[PDB]
């Protein structure tokens, strides 16, 4: 998961990545509109260096929502697990 990329001109993140924290995951307390990105996930193309194609977790929703809390944890299989809670 990569940090939010920033516009050279405004030196601020592009609109889609508005609410991401520096570590590439959304931030509790922010407000999220439709068609914005919650987790900037990308995965390699192996299916010489490995290219990465992007598969972000976008929010689809008819109405705004506020992020309540974001949980990080891992399983025994070393998988990262992210859970987010949204409020209306």
């Amino acid at each position: 998961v990569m940090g939010p990329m920033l516009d050279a001109a405004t030196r601020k993140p592009i609109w889609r990545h508005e609410i991401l924290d520096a570590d590439g995951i959304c931030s509790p307390g922010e407000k999220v509109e439709n068609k914005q990105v919650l987790v900037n996930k990308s995965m390699p193309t192996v299916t010489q260096q490995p290219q990465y194609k992007d598969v972000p977790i976008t929010y689809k929703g008819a109405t705004d929502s506020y992020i309540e809390k974001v949980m990080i944890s891992s399983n025994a299989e070393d998988a990262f697990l992210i859970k987010m809670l949204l409020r209306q």
């Binding site: 924290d21 949980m71 990080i72």
Partner: protein, 46 residues
Amino acid sequence: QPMIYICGECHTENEIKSRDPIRCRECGYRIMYKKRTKRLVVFDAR
């Protein structure tokens, strides 16, 4: 500089900034919550 996470049980501030496994620096607990954003947000009293 690095991001801070709050341990789910003892609330001791931790830092990862790495591919390390999620574990509390102090205790054995294995759940972490992100801190509240630093920006302000504007609400309507309605």
